[PDB]
């Protein structure tokens, strides 16, 4: 009797049916409060129903991306089909354009991602590890612009729509903020940007898993190419000597929210009044926030107890409320026609070239930095060009290397803001 026992969003079926009845009744009678409570009420039901179907689908889930993609696709298709009542559209747009819940979400993700890094590990990475990532980015850039010249695509479009979104952390953090920055600096429409970027991102995600173990085979051919199992060539040994307190109180977890809100306020004040522009180019508030949080981690003022708490809270937003946000993301940002128009042979060869360009740079840099070349890519350009943290367990699983999880997490999380800074700089300079 699978009709009794099958679970939807951690819920037995009859309870969900009761929940859906309320939404159907409200749609029938056309009565709805327009506020946070009214918003969540109709977002949760739609997200829950349309996410389980996406997750439990054979080919879609592992490769195309899973729930959020098809969720916001269906949201866009309803919007285009003119099914939603005007009150429903108003109530959905209110909690994202006047309550600005998106800003709170983004700030929480950024601070929770960065603050969890170990202070000693962060300081040690400052020596030669970060430059590998930076030069991987720049090495990908030159091949990207070169191959874009081949098809006659102008420089500005390649530098704003193909290099940055690919070299990010997924649409949770790496695409939406890019669109906000793009709207802030230039002033044109933002629907086009996100719509055309999300496609390329998914396309690249596939290629990432593709060459994942291909390189492993080449390494099997000749170790002369690179040593396996060790990040650095002739790597030595050391002692972690880590120490944390396991117990975390509800109060300890809450502190994380206070820190996140504070950092955002400081960033808004510095960009708007303390420094209008560092040089001839203005800096967006989000870019300033990434640097400020890093400074707090560097100081080490915070206790080890606090660092863990922000990790837990950021793990609650990224695993539960993401489905609720993604629906609104689809509603107010997506333009369906662009998605279809974005699929062509040039659009699938450009991303194939750029990923290869990334791998080459990080690899040579690692050898120069002394690190073993094979890992000098997987853990520096491959794992860095993914859908954020979700796809990082996949590329590593493709090869026989589970020991590099710490470095992979460092790569993804810490690069999630460096790219933001670089994108702000590029947007200011070129335009």
């Amino acid at each position, epitope marked *: 009797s699978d009709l009794l026992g099958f679970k939807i969003f951690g819920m037995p079926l009859p309870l969900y049916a009761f929940a859906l009845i309320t939404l159907l009744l409200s749609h029938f009678y056309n009565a709805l*409060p*327009t506020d946070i409570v009214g918003g969540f009420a109709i977002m949760f039901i739609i997200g829950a129903i349309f996410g389980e179907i996406g997750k439990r689908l054979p080919i879609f889930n592992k490769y195309i991306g899973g729930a959020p993609v098809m969720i916001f696709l269906v949201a866009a298709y309803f*919007v285009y089909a*003119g099914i939603f009542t*005007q009150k429903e559209i*108003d109530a959905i747009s209110n909690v994202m*354009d006047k309550s600005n819940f998106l800003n709170l979400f983004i700030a929480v993700l950024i601070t929770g991602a960065i603050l969890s890094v170990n202070r000693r590990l962060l300081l040690k990475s400052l020596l030669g590890y970060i430059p590998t990532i930076l030069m991987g980015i720049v090495g990908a850039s030159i091949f990207g612009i070169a191959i874009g010249l081949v098809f006659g695509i102008p420089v500005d479009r390649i530098m704003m729509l193909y290099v940055l979104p690919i070299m990010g952390g997924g649409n949770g953090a790496g695409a939406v903020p890019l669109s906000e920055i793009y709207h802030s600096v230039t002033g044109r429409s933002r629907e086009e940007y996100y719509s055309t970027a999300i496609a390329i991102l998914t396309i690249a995600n596939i290629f990432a898993i593709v060459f994942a173990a291909v390189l492993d085979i080449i390494g099997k051919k000749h170790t002369w190419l690179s040593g396996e199992g060790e990040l650095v060539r002739k790597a030595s040994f050391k002692v972690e000597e880590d120490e944390k307190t396991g117990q975390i109180t509800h109060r300890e977890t809450a502190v994380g929210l206070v820190l996140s809100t504070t950092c955002f306020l400081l960033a808004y004040v510095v960009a708007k009044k303390i420094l209008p522009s560092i040089g001839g180019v203005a800096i967006h508030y989000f870019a300033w926030m990434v640097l400020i949080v890093a400074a707090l981690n560097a100081s080490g003022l915070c206790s080890p107890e606090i660092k863990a708490g922000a990790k837990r809270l950021s793990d609650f937003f990224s695993k539960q409320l993401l489905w609720v946000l993604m629906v609104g993301v689809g*509603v107010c940002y997506t333009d369906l026609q662009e998605i279809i128009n974005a699929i062509t042979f040039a659009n699938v060869v450009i991303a194939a070239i750029i990923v290869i360009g990334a791998v080459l740079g990080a690899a040579i840099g690692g050898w120069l930095m002394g690190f073993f070349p094979i890992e000098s890519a997987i853990t520096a350009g491959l794992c860095m060009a993914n859908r954020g943290g979700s796809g990082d367990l996949e590329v590593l699983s493709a090869c026989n290397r589970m020991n590099l999880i710490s470095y992979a997490q460092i790569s993804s999380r810490l690069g999630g803001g460096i790219v933001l800074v670089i994108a702000s700089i590029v947007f200011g300079m070129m335009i």
Partner: antibody
């Protein structure tokens, strides 16, 4: 946040036909219902017409029913008002606004144009 | 018509900055859900929104205006006028799909 009409205007003989256009550059024009409101010189405000997003539902004021036409183009962030069989008393300044529902009724306005019957 | 009819009692005002406006607006029949609005318009420009619901406030408005009342009776009181605050004020309802406007009181000195 800028909304403007900047269309039509001038002196029109009775039975004349005039077209009014509106442009909005501050918000997401789509997914928002628009309204037309006119005010006669020396007189108070008055509703004219309104339209949903996607134009599914259209409603007119009783006075100008059957001679007026309203349309929109989301792709161009542009609103059109079509006027036919103009009469003498239809002299006023015509405004277009955005109806935002519960979170404020008429938040943003536009600089209307003057249309006068000759 | 079966339409809400909006009538305002005072016609015009002429007082010094320090006073209460006690402007009023009466309706034909019951207006559900307290859907109401108030606008002001200085000469030669578009109107501006002050009290979007029956009790709440807009963003830029100061803290001297305040609305109240429900059913078929409403008010709008000003704590203390200033030289910048002489213009015409209207009465707007949006209950049904037939918007209706009241008239505009005048405020002078």
């Amino acid at each position: 946040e800028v909304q403007l009409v900047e269309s039509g205007g001038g002196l029109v003989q009775p039975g004349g036909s005039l077209r009014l256009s509106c442009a909005a550059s501050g918000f997401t024009f789509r997914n928002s219902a628009m309204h037309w409101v006119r005010q006669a010189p020396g007189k108070g405000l008055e509703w004219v017409s309104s339209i949903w997003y996607s134009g599914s539902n259209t409603y007119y004021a009783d006075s100008v029913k059957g001679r007026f036409t309203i349309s929109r183009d989301n792709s161009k962030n542009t609103l059109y008002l079509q006027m036919n069989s103009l009469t003498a008393e239809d002299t006023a300044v015509y405004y277009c606004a955005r109806f935002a529902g519960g979170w404020g009724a008429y938040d943003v306005w536009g600089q209307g144009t003057l249309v006068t019957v000759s | 018509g079966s339409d809400i009819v909006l009538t305002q009692s005072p016609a015009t005002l002429s007082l010094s900055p320090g006073e209460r406006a006690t402007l009023s607006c009466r309706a034909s029949q019951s207006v559900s859900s307290n859907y109401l609005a108030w606008y002001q318009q200085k000469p030669g420009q578009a109107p501006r929104l002050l009290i979007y619901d029956s009790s709440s406030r807009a963003t830029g408005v100061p803290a001297r205006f305040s609305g109240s009342g429900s059913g078929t009776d409403f008010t709008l009181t000003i704590s203390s006028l200033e030289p910048e605050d002489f213009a015409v004020y209207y009465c707007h309802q949006y209950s049904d799909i037939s918007p209706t406007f009241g008239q505009g009181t005048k405020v002078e000195i």
